[PDB]
Amino acid sequence: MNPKRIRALKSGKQGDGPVVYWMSRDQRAEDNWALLFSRAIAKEANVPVVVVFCLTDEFLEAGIRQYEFMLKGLQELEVSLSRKKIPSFFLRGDPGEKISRFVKDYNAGTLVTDFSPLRIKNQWIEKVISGISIPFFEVDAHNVVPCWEASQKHEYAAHTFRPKLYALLPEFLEEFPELEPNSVTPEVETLSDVLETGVKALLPERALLKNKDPLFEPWHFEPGEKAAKKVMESFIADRLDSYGALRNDPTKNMLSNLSPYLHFGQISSQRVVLEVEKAESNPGSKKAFLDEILIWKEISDNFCYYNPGYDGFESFPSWAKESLNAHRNDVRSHIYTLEEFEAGKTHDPLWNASQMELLSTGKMHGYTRMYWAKKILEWSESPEKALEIAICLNDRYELDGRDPNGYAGIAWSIGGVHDRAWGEREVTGKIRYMSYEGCKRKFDVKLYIEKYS
Ligand SMILES: Cc1cc2nc3c(=O)[nH]c(=O)nc-3n(C[C@H](O)[C@H](O)[C@H](O)COP(=O)(O)OP(=O)(O)OC[C@H]3O[C@@H](n4cnc5c(N)ncnc54)[C@H](O)[C@@H]3O)c2cc1C
Q: Is 247 in the pocket of ligand 1 (CB under 6 A)?
A: yes
Quick check: 6 and 138 in contact, CB under 8 A? yes
Domain end: 312, 340, 358, which one?
312
Does 109 share its domain with 168?
no
Q: If we measure between CA atoms, which residue out of 240, 267, 257, 227 comes closest to residue 357?
A: 257
Does 308 share its domain with 177?
yes
DSSP state of 54: E
Does 41 share its domain with 125?
yes
Resolution (A): 2.1
Quick check: 73 and 34 in contact, CB under 8 A? no
**E strands, 312-439, in order:** none
- Please name the residue whose Cα sits nearest to atom 14 of ligand 1: 406
How far apart are the CA of 84 and the centre of ligand 1, in A? 33
**E strands, 48-166, in order:** 49-55, 88-92, 110-114, 136-139
Does 290 share its domain with 173?
yes
Q: How many domains does the chain have?
A: 3
Does 408 share its domain with 265?
no
Q: Could you give the C-alpha distances from 108 to 22, 81, 134, 181, 389, in angstroms and in order?
A: 12, 19, 8, 19, 43
Q: Is 31 annotated as a binding residue?
A: no
Does 160 share its domain with 268?
yes
Q: Is 293 in the pocket of ligand 1 (CB under 6 A)?
A: yes
Does 170 share its domain with 306?
yes
Does 227 share its domain with 259?
yes
Q: Is 405 annotated as a binding residue?
A: yes
Domain end: 124, 141, 158, which one?
141
Does 160 share its domain with 54?
no
Q: Is 9 annotated as a binding residue?
A: no
Domain end: 270, 293, 312, which one?
312
Does 304 share its domain with 200?
yes
How far apart are the CA of 363 and the centre of ligand 1, in A? 9
For the chain, breaks with the C atom over 2.5 A from the next N come after 187
Does 103 share its domain with 228?
no
DSSP tally for the chain: helices H, then strands E: 22, 6
- Please name the residue whose Cα sits nearest to atom 21 of ligand 1: 366
Q: Is 290 in the pocket of ligand 1 (CB under 6 A)?
A: no
Query: What is the spatial distance between Cα 60 and Cα 190, in angstroms, rounded to a whole number?
Result: 19
Burial of 79 (0-12, 13-18, 19+ CB in 10 A): exposed
How far apart are the CA of 300 and the centre of ligand 1, in A? 10
Domain extent for 50:
1-141
Instruction: Report helix, strand or coil for 6.
Output: strand
Does 102 share its domain with 155?
no
Provide the 10 A C-beta neighbour count for residue 390.
Answer: 26
How far apart are the CA of 401 and the centre of ligand 1, in A? 10
Question: Residue 186 contacts by C-beta under 8 Å, 6 or more apart in sequence?
Answer: 18, 48, 50, 85, 87
Angle (nearest 5°) at CA 238 between 235 and 243: 70
